[PDB]
């Protein structure tokens, strides 16, 4: 799974 | 900003 | 998975 | 800015 | 996976 | 700026 | 994977 | 600027 922060 | 760890 | 921060 | 670790 | 920060 | 580690 | 910062 | 490590 991708790990994404915005 | 979000703080995200995976 | 990609790891991406914006 | 987001702080992201994977 | 790519690791990308912007 | 984002801070990102993978 | 590429590692990219902007 | 982003700070990015892969």
XYZ file of C-alpha atoms in Angstrom:
48
model
C 0.000 0.000 0.000
C 1.008 3.591 -0.709
C 1.694 5.934 2.215
C 0.484 9.449 1.436
C 0.316 12.721 3.400
C -1.090 16.068 2.237
C 0.449 19.374 7.256
C -0.588 15.783 7.922
C 1.827 13.465 9.740
C 1.616 9.939 8.346
C 3.498 6.681 9.004
C 3.014 3.318 7.275
C 3.874 1.207 -2.538
C 4.882 4.798 -3.248
C 5.568 7.141 -0.324
C 4.358 10.656 -1.102
C 4.190 13.928 0.861
C 2.784 17.275 -0.301
C 4.323 20.581 4.717
C 3.286 16.990 5.383
C 5.700 14.672 7.202
C 5.490 11.146 5.807
C 7.372 7.888 6.465
C 6.887 4.525 4.736
C 7.747 2.414 -5.077
C 8.756 6.005 -5.786
C 9.441 8.348 -2.862
C 8.231 11.863 -3.641
C 8.063 15.135 -1.677
C 6.658 18.483 -2.840
C 8.196 21.789 2.179
C 7.159 18.198 2.845
C 9.574 15.880 4.663
C 9.363 12.353 3.269
C 11.245 9.095 3.927
C 10.761 5.732 2.198
C 11.621 3.621 -7.615
C 12.629 7.212 -8.325
C 13.315 9.555 -5.401
C 12.105 13.070 -6.179
C 11.937 16.342 -4.216
C 10.531 19.690 -5.378
C 12.070 22.996 -0.360
C 11.033 19.405 0.306
C 13.447 17.087 2.125
C 13.237 13.560 0.730
C 15.119 10.302 1.388
C 14.635 6.939 -0.341
